[PDB]
Symmetry: C3
């Protein structure tokens, strides 16, 4: 007996250094409905309703700005004013009503043409989302 | 066909500098049931049950302490020790069981009578909450 | 009528200084089904399904690494790079599918043998989780 379900939880373990593009998380904690696509780093709404989104990422670059995108524009914009060195750790959560076809993803902005020396890492960056409430009916 | 639903997600983009008062988030990501009131900055429970709350805010002041209030007292107290440059970015999440009429809001405390020069900003601070489980019945 | 429900939200206020062991949160914001055991500091899955987990903790030690465990292995590994003052404030969220018997808990690692002088504190660290989707049936 079918139930309107949609959720995904994905990570990176590190590498976030490319700006202006959708961050493509490939570590899958959960993506049963395959509504999230690691090839594009985008979540595709296949069920209209209220979704909850949450992310915790580590960005390796200077003056980092994080944007959570819905459809084609930034709906959430993070600019941690407490950025030290060339590493930024941003997080956020929000509820977004989505229609079928609506896309949601994360994107970073900043300078990485002058990054110091890397390190061990093994630090999980995550992007999660799930359908809270299915629309009308 | 009615369903016990209650959720809200609101932000500010910036303005939080006044302490001791409910932070009035006015940017509405979601507030369909209008259980959140931007005039008071408080969420009003209209359905008894278990609620999840989550916030990510940036506070412009020193020696900042953040409190999530339920009814009339702080249930969550955040005093990040990682403060420096008079810019505190506190976050938190918790599950609270609420009864009809219970109010929930965020409140900050600190010294804002010696803040340096501002900046571009454009940094979303958010307050989100949703009914997870409706009570008994 | 029975509803497959399972959620918990617990905190500490301060203490986390001992590494390698499951953090025992004892402040109960919610633990109605008693699925979280404050004695062992572990959540026990009593209902198979999709769970959302969220945590915001403050660790008092140096070179702090944080791990969210599922059953016996670390699922999430948080190694905040912007650490200082021997105080690490880590947070994370993720969705995990669990089977009955599966245990989930938080554990920290790091050097706490030589920490500086404490302070007021009163800083709520939290560990929360809830069943999102009950399994098949």
């Amino acid at each position: 007996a079918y139930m309107y379900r949609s959720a995904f939880s994905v990570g990176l373990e590190t590498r976030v250094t490319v700006p202006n593009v959708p961050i493509r998380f490939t570590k899958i904690f959960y993506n049963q409905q395959n509504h999230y696509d690691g090839s594009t780093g985008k979540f595709y709404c296949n069920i209209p309703g209220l979704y909850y989104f949450s992310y915790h990422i580590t960005v390796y670059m200077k003056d980092v700005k994080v944007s959570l995108f819905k459809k084609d524009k930034a709906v959430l914009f993070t600019y941690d004013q407490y950025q030290e060195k060339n590493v930024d750790q941003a997080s956020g959560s929000v509820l977004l009503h989505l229609e079928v076809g609506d896309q949601v993803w994360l994107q970073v902005y900043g300078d990485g043409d002058h990054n110091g020396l890397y390190a061990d890492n093994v630090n999980d960056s995550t992007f999660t989302g799930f359908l809270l409430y299915h629309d009308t009916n």
